[PDB]
């Protein structure tokens, strides 16, 4: 275990842990609450690099976390979707990918049409599914 501890292991192992990566993603001991505590101008070059790094920290976290909210998966770490898998994406079989490719390799295998999957993802799970209440919310 550890942060990215299973980065080189098979995809089945990264499926098993996963939180250790998600936990250490927003806040860090490195930030350490700023201030010297314990000259009186904090306009130094260091303060500029820190604050612009604290911004992109939450700017990149919220850019990805906004994606989880529009897919109905905000509350959980792994959610299933109602989008069928299209064979043009990969020809490999069920146990052939989860035990032989590792995630590091997999991100390069879908990076071509990865944005296209994201487009179809907002539709089937939250554009129609959240709409389907119309008939079932009350009759």
């Amino acid at each position: 275990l550890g942060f990215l501890g299973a980065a080189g292991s098979t995809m089945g192992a990264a499926s098993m842990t996963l939180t250790v990566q998600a936990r250490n993603l927003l806040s860090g001991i490195v930030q350490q609450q700023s201030n010297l505590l314990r000259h009186l101008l904090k306009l130094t070059v260091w303060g500029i690099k820190q604050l612009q790094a604290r911004v992109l920290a939450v700017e990149r976290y919220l850019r990805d976390q906004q994606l989880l909210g529009i897919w109905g998966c905000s509350g959980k770490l792994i959610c299933c979707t109602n989008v069928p898998w299209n064979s043009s994406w990969s020809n490999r079989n069920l146990s052939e990918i989860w035990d032989n490719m590792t995630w590091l390799q997999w991100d390069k295998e879908i990076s071509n049409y990865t944005q296209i999957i994201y487009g179809l993802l907002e539709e089937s799970q939250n554009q129609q599914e959240k709409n389907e209440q119309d008939l079932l919310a009350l009759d």
């Binding site: 209440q133 119309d134 919310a137 009350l138």
Partner: protein, 451 residues
């Protein structure tokens, strides 16, 4: 009927608000010549793809005089200009008694050969060198004439950086997340009102900060016949913006062959004086196609007809009162600042229904502090070599006919009194809005009973 409330995240609604925008432009100056005064060393790159949506069914109301994007523009340029002069050579030692003489009357004289005493690299020793200065930039004091810089009386002085481009390049204004800029796609847009054709582009068009006076350059023009916009017509006092449909071409050039004379005033600092002129002295000029100009001036009086007393007498006079630098078509070109006599363009009057080309006399100033800023003035170093500008003229600025109580006729003379109106000629169609994604609406739908 047990109607229940239901929430909707992402509702298309907005309210008029003005936030902070930022810069956008692609590959411009780069390696060969950079250090642009406006684009700095880095602007956020513009996306190659512009996003425009023709908002349907919507009729949002615009206002170009109460719009704050033009005021954000104004205070940005001022703070952008001062940031590009702050780290450079200050010319405080340039305030000494100047003994100057004419040049080759041959007993024609508008520049003076100045000798004066100035500090060198070593603080202990002094040095005497000559330099040429334009008229009005220097003034007498009380046999041998004695002069002084016109700014040493008033505020301080700082030399413009030697390798800085004052050329206006397109700067894009674009909104922050949760905000959007609305574009008036209605060709005819009298003053401001409800615009039927709106778009919500994320980024404006290519806006060039053309520092101009009375007449605008390199601007945007709608397709219909020339547009006339006033905050209030009939308030003789408020100025008048004018958009063309086709721009006129005016080319200007300074025939003087200035040599560069760098003289150090202490360490690292080097004053760039006008050297000795090569070739016969020639006054700077502006060419206007007289054919092209006569029709542009005509289409305006046709559009102005339906806005001022219908069919009556419309005259054009030379500026009218004011100061010498605000009543002439001031602008920057290549680094030297021209001030052209506009009295030759606003003298004709038409009413009741290879090629010759007008030319305009122009003088040059090296001492400047723009936007009526009395804080600190700057010296523009003379540009070594040949000068030639070739920019379209797309806009205009007009003013009063005094206070003629009703009566016989109306006259409009130019008066680019302020700089912010120049950008209003580029921002008449835009306005930013604040998206509010939270909307609540009722429907006969409730979630699970217990949970």
């Amino acid at each position: 009927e047990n109607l229940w409330v239901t929430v909707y995240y992402g509702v298309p609604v907005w309210k008029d608000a003005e936030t902070t925008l930022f810069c956008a432009s692609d590959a411009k100056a780069y390696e060969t010549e950079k250090h642009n005064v406006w684009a700095t060393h880095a602007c956020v790159p513009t996306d190659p793809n512009p996003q425009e949506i023709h908002l349907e069914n919507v009729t949002e109301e615009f206002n170009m005089w109460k719009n704050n994007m033009v005021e954000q523009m104004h205070t940005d340029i001022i703070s952008l200009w001062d940031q590009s002069l702050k780290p450079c050579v200050k010319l405080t030692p340039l305030c000494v008694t100047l003994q100057c003489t004419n040049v080759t009357n041959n007993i024609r004289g508008e520049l003076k050969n100045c000798s004066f005493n100035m500090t060198t690299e070593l603080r202990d020793k002094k040095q005497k060198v000559y330099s040429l200065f334009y008229r009005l930039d220097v003034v007498q004091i009380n046999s041998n004439k004695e002069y002084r810089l016109i700014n040493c009386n008033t505020s301080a002085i700082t030399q413009a950086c030697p390798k800085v481009s004052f050329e206006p390049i397109p700067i894009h204004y674009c909104a922050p997340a949760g905000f959007a800029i609305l574009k008036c796609k209605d060709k005819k847009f009298n003053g401001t009102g409800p615009c039927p054709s709106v778009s919500t582009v994320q980024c404006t068009h290519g806006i060039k900060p053309v520092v101009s006076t009375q007449l605008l350059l390199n601007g945007s023009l709608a397709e219909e016949e020339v547009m006339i916009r006033s905050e209030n017509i009939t308030n003789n006092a408020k100025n008048i913006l004018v958009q063309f449909n086709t721009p006129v071409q005016i080319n200007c050039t300074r025939p003087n062959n200035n040599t560069r004379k760098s003289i150090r005033i202490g360490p690292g600092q080097a004053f760039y004086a006008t050297g000795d002129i090569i070739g016969d002295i020639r006054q700077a000029h502006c060419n206007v196609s007289k054919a092209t100009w006569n029709e542009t001036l005509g289409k305006v009086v046709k559009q102005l007809r339906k806005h001022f007393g219908n069919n009556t007498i419309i005259r054009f006079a030379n500026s009218s009162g004011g100061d010498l630098e605000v009543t002439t078509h001031s602008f920057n070109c290549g680094g030297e600042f021209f001030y052209c006599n506009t009295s030759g363009l606003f003298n004709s009057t038409w009413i009741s229904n290879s090629n010759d080309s007008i030319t305009l006399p122009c003088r040059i100033k090296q001492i400047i502090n723009m936007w009526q800023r009395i804080g600190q003035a700057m010296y523009a170093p003379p540009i070594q070599g040949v000068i030639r500008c070739v920019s379209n003229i797309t806009g205009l600025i007009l003013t009063r006919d005094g206070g003629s109580t009703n009566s016989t006729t109306e006259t409009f003379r130019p008066g680019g009194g302020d700089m912010r109106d120049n950008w209003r000629s580029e921002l008449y169609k835009y306005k930013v809005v604040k998206i509010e994604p939270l909307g609540v609406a009722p429907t006969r739908c409730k979630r699970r009973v217990v949970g």
